[PDB]
Amino acid sequence: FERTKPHVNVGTIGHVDHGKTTLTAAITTVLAKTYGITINTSHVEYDTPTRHYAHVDCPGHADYVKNMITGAAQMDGAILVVAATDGPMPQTREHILLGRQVGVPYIIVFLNKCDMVDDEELLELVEMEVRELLSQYDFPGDDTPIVRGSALKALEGDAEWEAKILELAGFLDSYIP
Ligand SMILES: Nc1nc2c(ncn2[C@@H]2O[C@H](COP(=O)(O)OP(=O)(O)O)[C@@H](O)[C@H]2O)c(=O)[nH]1
Ligand SMILES: [Mg+2]
Numbered sequence: 001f002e003r004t005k006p007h008v009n010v011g012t013i014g015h016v017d018h019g020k021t022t023l024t025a026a027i028t029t030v031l032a033k034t035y036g037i038t039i040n041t042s043h044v045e046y047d048t049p050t051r052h053y054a055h056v057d058c059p060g061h062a063d064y065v066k067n068m069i070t071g072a073a074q075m076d077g078a079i080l081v082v083a084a085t086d087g088p089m090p091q092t093r094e095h096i097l098l099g100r101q102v103g104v105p106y107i108i109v110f111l112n113k114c115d116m117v118d119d120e121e122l123l124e125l126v127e128m129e130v131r132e133l134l135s136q137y138d139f140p141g142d143d144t145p146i147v148r149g150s151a152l153k154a155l156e157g158d159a160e161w162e163a164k165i166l167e168l169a170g171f172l173d174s175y176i177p
Contacts, residue, residue: 008176009054011075011104013064015091018083019112019151023168024057026154030165039063039072050173061091068102077176078104079168084113084126084148088133100138107134108145108175110168115150115161123148145171 014020024044031046040063046053056073058064067073078099082088099107109130117123127146134141149164 004052006051007054008051008077008172009056009074010077010079010172010176011068011073012055012057012079012081013092013095013099013107014081014083015086015089015095016061017086018081018092020057020081021059022151022155023079023081023110023112024055026151026162026165027055027168029155030162031169034166037066037070039067041067041072048169048173051176053172061094064091064095065098068098068104075099075102075104076106077172078107079172080107080109081112081151082109082126082130084111084117084123086113087126088129093133093137096133096137096139106176107139108168108171109134109147110151111146111148112151114148115153145175147171 012020012024028044028046035047035049040059042057042059044055046055058067082092111126130146131141134144147164147167149161153159153161154165
């Protein structure tokens with residue numbers, strides 16, 4: 001465990017537009033500064049000072065469903081992007097169940113479109129309805145980290161937004177046993 005230092009494969013589940021691919025990109029970049037069948041799959045490896053991460057993001061639902069259903073991925077940690085602009089839409093609900101069956105123990109939720117969402121009243125509201133799916137279908141939903149940034153900003157520059165990706169990394173290290 002000491003070389004890898006604990007090696008963690010963290011699984012990113014969206015609907016179609018939320019920014020996972022984006023979320024996925026941002027995390028690495030942030031990470032670099034601060035520290036440093038047919039199957040279709042996209043892979044990134046990332047490191048916090050504690051854990052080391054392998055990350056999988058799939059261009060499509062079809063991918064998530066097949067990839068999650070067989071064996072592709074193995075996903076200890078599932079990082080979830082629900083985007084404020086919309087709300088949790090089908091692909092998110094589906095992804096949540098599928099996860100439960102899959103045996104995806106931990107889903108950590110990240111809320112993207114806060115480059116576009118001014119409204120504590122909405123956010124709570126995106127944020128509540130997530131909590132509501134998570135439970136009905138699987139998960140705690142209470143004692144479950146919800147992180148709001150905006151991935152797009154974070155790469156792109158400087159920012160407060162960047163900082164949040166840091167919580168995401170942080171929770172990861174914590175939330176995931
Ligand atoms: N404004 C804004 N747009 C975003 C953000 N993240 C992603 N997008 C944009 O929305 C489009 C779809 O996002 P994407 O990451 O590809 O979604 P995915 O299908 O879940 O992988 C992208 O081309 C991005 O330019 C974000 O945090 N803010
Ligand atoms: Mg994608």
